């Protein structure tokens, strides 16, 4: 009966501050290919896209 988040989601990053938000590793590109190099590698803080992150939310709601 209890739904329970795209557990998956909760798992793959997918984090919330009960304030009303979430984030995933900047994940812009990184930790994958990258015969890239430096400065580019400057993107690993965290990030969050609004609008959309609702589904995410309620799917989750209950734990993570």
């Amino acid at each position: 009966m209890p739904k329970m988040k795209t557990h998956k989601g909760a798992k793959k990053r997918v984090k919330i501050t009960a304030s009303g938000k979430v984030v995933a590793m900047k994940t812009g590109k990184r930790h994958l290919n990258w015969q890239k190099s430096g400065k580019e590698i400057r993107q690993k803080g965290r990030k969050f896209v609004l609008a959309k992150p609702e589904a995410e939310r309620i799917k989750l709601l209950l734990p993570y």
């Binding site: 015969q35 890239k36 190099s37 430096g38």
Partner: protein, 49 residues
Amino acid sequence: RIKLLLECTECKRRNYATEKNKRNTPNKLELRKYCPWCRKHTVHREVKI
């Protein structure tokens, strides 16, 4: 695989920094420079295959 192969720099056992590079013209010749997070800057060296 082409005269373009990827290497990267490491420094006197006290770190390693990265970046790709090539193969063509002077091939192997690979000292270079760069600076690790070792100490404050430091040679580094480069090479590392």
